[PDB]
């Protein structure tokens, strides 16, 4: 009949069949269930949508049109949960948060 | 000419659908691709290890849901299981 995507069926933008293929040839299990790629497309849209919202908010506060990795650094370093998730990762041209010790400030 | 096969256009479409006006650089696309891939083998390795734990030769939504609960801390776990449960539920109705 008419071809219809599982992403279109489930209301997902991320490709369910492609992440399904990466689960098949990713050497993780000999069999794979139907709902796991839909679940992964959902959680990856959550993660990308959330940190892109934080990056877009940082860009709108800085008044830039274009998302720069500095905005991504300011997005993920300013959240405790993202810092717990992404503590051991470096980001290309991210830099650091503006942070000094209060004692280093003069009297 | 070698089918590099990245995730750039899907991050582009989600970025357009939730931010209709913001611009974007290709370096941030490289950052996004590296991030989504790193999360992918992390959560897939957790799902494989947990399926091998319970002598399960299949990966369905339950063990990989438990992997979501293990990896994502705080409110991320409950919001992610909400999005995933809604997605697989409305997908089941098709």
């Amino acid at each position, epitope marked *: 009949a008419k071809a219809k995507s599982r992403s279109s069926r489930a209301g997902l933008q991320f490709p369910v069949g492609r992440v399904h293929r990466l689960l098949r040839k990713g050497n993780y299990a000999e069999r794979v269930g139907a709902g796991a790629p839909v679940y992964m497309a959902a959680v990856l849209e959550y993660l990308t949508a*959330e940190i892109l919202e934080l990056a877009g908010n940082a860009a709108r506060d800085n008044k830039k049109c274009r998302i720069i990795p500095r905005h991504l650094q300011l997005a993920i370093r300013n*959240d*405790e*949960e993202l*810092n717990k998730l992404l503590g051991k990762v470096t980001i290309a041209q991210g830099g650091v948060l503006p942070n000094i010790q209060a004692v280093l400030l003069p009297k | 000419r070698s089918r590099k096969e990245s995730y750039s256009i899907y991050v582009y479409k989600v970025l357009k659908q*939730v931010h209709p006006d913001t611009g974007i650089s290709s370096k941030a696309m490289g950052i996004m691709n590296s991030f989504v891939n790193d999360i992918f083998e992390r959560i897939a390795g957790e799902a494989s290890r947990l399926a091998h734990y319970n002598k399960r030769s299949t990966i369905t939504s339950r063990e990989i849901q438990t992997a979501v609960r293990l990896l994502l801390p*705080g409110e991320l776990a409950k*919001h992610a299981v*909400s999005e995933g449960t809604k997605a697989v539920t409305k997908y089941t109705s098709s």
Partner: single-chain antibody
Amino acid sequence: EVQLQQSGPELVEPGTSVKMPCKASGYTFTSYTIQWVKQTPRQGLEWIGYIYPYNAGTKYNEKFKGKATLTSDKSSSTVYMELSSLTSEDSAVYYCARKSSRLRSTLDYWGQGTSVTVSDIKMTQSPSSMHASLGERVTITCKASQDIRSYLSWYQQKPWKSPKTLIYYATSLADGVPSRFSGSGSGQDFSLTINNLESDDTATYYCLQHGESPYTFGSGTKLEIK
């Protein structure tokens, strides 16, 4: 398990400055934003600002900028609201409540409310009041001015009591709430549908948006049962 302690009522002369705490327990203190909201009887609820104790980040409403000041103590898990140069039009009940840093999350738990007496986007709640028996439908409207990406939540407060969260992200239920409540709508039109009505359900209802930086409540709606 989660607790949000506050201080008692204050009898304060005009022109001074008052410090009050929002000691909380039962959760990881640095991982949650703490919001402050005041309650005036003639304008309803008015959001003030929020604090994020993981990095001490501040953000205030421009209507309350300068008057409002937030100081946080990480050691005792206690945050402090500071009102400076108290005028006559400050006598209100002040609430402090918790919200996660996630945009999908909303104000989940509330304090008891400190009643202090003194010696943009517009949100519209269309039906102001209604009368109903114990078993019929009821529909509340939360039409907004600008576009909100489903970043809306509903709250119910009893008189002289703390508000209780009902819905989050305008469609998904909170914790402990029964399935009688059901939210719908996206964009600018939002609605909440209640299946069955009980004697405890009569209260005042508000809908709050958080898709924009000024957090704006509706006008409110008093519900009457039987």
